[PDB]
Design a binder for this molecule. Structure first.
Ligand SMILES: CC(C)(COP(=O)(O)OP(=O)(O)OC[C@H]1O[C@@H](n2cnc3c(N)ncnc32)[C@H](O)[C@@H]1OP(=O)(O)O)[C@@H](O)C(=O)NCCC(=O)NCCS
Ligand SMILES: CC(C)(COP(=O)(O)OP(=O)(O)OC[C@H]1O[C@@H](n2cnc3c(N)ncnc32)[C@H](O)[C@@H]1OP(=O)(O)O)[C@@H](O)C(=O)NCCC(=O)NCCS
Lengths: 252, 252
């Protein structure tokens, strides 16, 4: 049974949606890790405590170098504590601010690491949703780590149509749209559908209206255009992304 | 402002999911109507009180001879009262039990009345969901009346795919599957995908596995087969159903 008594609390790593994250050290092993404190008060009033518990159980069994490791968890009267792998190099979003934009090697290596973790979860019947640069942390070796909870595992009837008893929404096909948006932003520095207002961004996502700057090579354009399909079923498989010539030629 | 003081309560018409329905008479007009009493205690604990209020506002503006008229509504400390049009001839489900099965004239006339009410709501940006025989009441002239509440009116974004910002589920295309299931049950006496167990019914809906008894004519088979498409976008429009040769030849 884990307890707050087992950890030495250090500097705060930052503040999240429902609490704070601290650098910590397990007292017996002297092992450095991150302790994410989530207040049940604002978790229950946001209506996400049930959603969170499901996402924590799924992540507790995921072991992949490109997925932030959840070692364990515990709780008290008002808080829930998550024992997490500490990522020392920060977020990809901030690294993209430091470098303005990534080159083709770093971009293809990031896509390779993302596609490996997603294909690992695909084999483990785990599906991931939308992926942001802010939810991507970097380990000590420069490898990225998916660091969010967006994981999922998946009489009257006589009158229901198939679109209400089947499936249905949504399969492991949104992560492929995310690979297209991320790969674009990594190479360019901006998301492909960013606009001056809300409805203009909404329209350009609905019609898939994006263009490439003149410094984006044909291999990157080919990968981004195949990932960014309005039809989810026509987006590649995760194996095709890992075997794409631009990826196999530029990935580390 | 309506109040329970304005009505004389008579015999109970039946018991619903969240209350009871009574025959009533407005004291000033001596007008016979039905008073549906819904207990807020079991409405709030079932998590449907918010859903119900939205469905009641939509129905309060629907005026169609084949839609059960909602005259008004009021509430007190623990109950919500719905002033409804009284249907004297009961449900189509019970009439189907009395007649075992309907002929082609009654079936086509029922489909015509259902399609008119749905096309009326389609023009009023109102969409209806699954339709059961138990939710279809009969007026004094033998016309059916839809008598349920299944009515509806319809920064991070940079990383969301179109299948999450668009639409999406589900359009006014489930009512067309309902017309196929109802038209079949009216002519046959049983829903087309009824089976001995749950998963067998689930499978035959998923694969659209249904057959016609030898007494079902080709015109009815043509209408049912076009309504019962696994692809919603390939189901007819409500105007095609009203113009179908089997409908136009048998409807009253
Ligand atoms: C998105 C947001 C609400 C937080 O959401 P969240 O899902 O709760 O994020 P988390 O709780 O998982 O992590 C919060 C912090 O702890 C850090 N962290 C979490 N786990 C970590 C770990 N194992 N190792 C190292 N750092 C970690 C994160 O990097 C983050 O730091 P940051 O805020 O400096 O980037 C917050 O980032 C925000 O509002 N930022 C400002 C908005 C803005 O200015 N621009 C973006 C438009 S929305
Ligand atoms: C579906 C069920 C739970 C009720 O759900 P509901 O949406 O709350 O139904 P309602 O509150 O709108 O109406 C309830 C009664 O009032 C009647 N009623 C409602 N409004 C009326 C009106 N304006 N005029 C006349 N009668 C009316 C209905 O006909 C119904 O009568 P019934 O139960 O004898 O058929 C209930 O019908 C049931 O459980 N039946 C038994 C199940 C069964 O044996 N077979 C079906 C498999 S589920």
């Amino acid at each position: 049974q884990w307890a707050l008594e087992d950890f030495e609390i250090g500097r705060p790593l930052g503040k999240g949606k429902f609490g704070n994250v601290y650098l910590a050290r397990e007292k017996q092993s002297k092992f450095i890790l991150a302790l994410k404190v989530l207040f049940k008060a604002q978790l229950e009033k946001a209506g996400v405590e049930h959603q969170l518990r499901r996402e924590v159980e799924i992540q507790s069994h995921l072991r992949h170098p490109n997925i932030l490791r959840l070692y364990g968890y515990f709780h008290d009267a008002t808080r829930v504590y998550l024992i997490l792998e500490y990522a020392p190099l920060g977020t990809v979003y901030r690294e993209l601010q430091k470098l303005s934009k990534f080159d083709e090697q770093r971009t293809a290596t990031y896509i390779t690491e993302l596609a490996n973790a997603l294909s690992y979860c695909h084999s483990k019947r785990v599906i991931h949703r939308d992926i942001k640069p802010e939810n991507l942390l970097l380990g000590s070796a420069g490898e990225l780590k998916i660091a969010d909870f967006g994981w999922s595992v998946h009489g009257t009837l006589d009158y229901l149509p198939p679109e209400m008893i089947e499936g249905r929404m949504h399969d492991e096909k949104v992560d492929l749209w995310s690979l297209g948006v991320l790969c674009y932003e990594f190479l360019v520095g901006k998301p492909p559908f960013e606009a001056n207002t809300y409805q203009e961004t909404y329209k350009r996502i609905s019609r898939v209206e994006f263009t490439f700057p003149d410094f984006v090579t044909e291999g990157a354009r080919d990968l981004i255009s195949r990932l960014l399909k309005h039809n989810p079923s026509q987006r590649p498989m995760l194996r095709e992304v890992l075997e794409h010539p631009w990826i196999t030629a530029n990935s580390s």
